[PDB]
Chain A
Amino acid sequence: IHPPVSYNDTAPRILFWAQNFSVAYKDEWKDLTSLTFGVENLNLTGSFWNDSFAMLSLTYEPLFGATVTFKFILASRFYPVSARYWFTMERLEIHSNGSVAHFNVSQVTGPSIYSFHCEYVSSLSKKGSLLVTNVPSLWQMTLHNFQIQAFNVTGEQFSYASDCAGFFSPGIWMGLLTTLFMLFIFTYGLHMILSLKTMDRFDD
């Protein structure tokens, strides 16, 4: 079993894990899994943490003929509605031989007391497509069984997790609020049609 990458500052503060971590530049996929998880040499230069902000920096020497770094950037806003610190990863950054690329990750959020887990975080269409690009890019990315926690961590172990995928999603919830409405309308229709009867008698 692969160990989570753990960022330690007097105690463990950020945890990151995947069943697979891979990336591509110009469609050339590279597996980073064996270059990452449990690797004692794993370069975390410029990783950072604060009570309400976090940056896991993952750096590598051979990828795409360059030193490359990923910054996983997370916040712990106080969501006033629920009076709890919901966290979010609002962006990823990729720093290259001389430039930066970015993604917006959509759904990565939960209360700070819990990790977040998703079966995919990726830019690739079939793998949830959570990494939206607002402009065209040479980068593509996939985290498989992505699990992250950057606040309220205890020990080199996650707390419980908000799974990304629930019993409902937009197209389903809107699909039901139509369907479990027009099926009521159909039953009113069918009640009147099934109430149809005919006389057992006729005049002379």
Chain B
Amino acid sequence: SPYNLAYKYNLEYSVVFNLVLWIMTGLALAVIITSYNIWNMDPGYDSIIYR
């Protein structure tokens, strides 16, 4: 650009950024934790697990 005008980062950028960051942290944890709990359940097929 001809004048080195700044990258125009809006006001409320900290608000958008923290909303996005903490919603995506919360959703990443709720996925990862849920994924871990479902990935590592004991299927518990006791009458056949030993055979």
B35 interface contact, C-beta 8 A: no
- Listed in ascending order, the chain A residues whose CB lies under 8 Å from chain B are 1, 3-4, 17, 115, 117-120, 127-128, 145, 147, 156-161, 163-169, 172, 175-176
Interchain CA distance A163-B9 in the complex, whole Å: 7
Work out how many contacts link A and B, with CB atoms closer than 8 A.
66
In the assembled complex, B47 has its CB within 8 A of some CB on chain A: no
Are B6 and A147 closer than 8 Å at their CB atoms? yes
Within 8 A of A (CB), among B1-32: 1-15, 17-18
By a beta-carbon cutoff of 8 Å, the part of chain B in contact with chain A is: 1-15, 17-18
Main secondary structure of the interface of B (DSSP, over half): loop
Residues on the B chain within 8 Å of A159, using CB: 4
Q: Once the chains bind, are A172 and B18 in contact (CB under 8 Å)?
A: yes
> Chain A nearest CB: distance from B38 CB in Å?
17
Q: Of the candidates B3, B6, B15, which one forms a contact with A172 in the assembled complex, judged by CB atoms under 8 Å apart?
A: B15
B9–A165 contact, CB under 8 A? yes
Assembly CA distance A127 to B8 (angstroms): 15
Give Cα distance in the complex from A117 to B1, angstroms. Answer: 16
Q: Which residues of B contact A166 (CB under 8 A)?
A: 13-14
CA separation between A168 and B4, bound complex, in Å? 25
Known A1-B2, A167-B18; further 8 A-B contacts with Cβ < 8 A: A4-B3, A117-B6, A119-B9, A119-B11, A147-B5, A163-B7, A166-B13, A167-B14
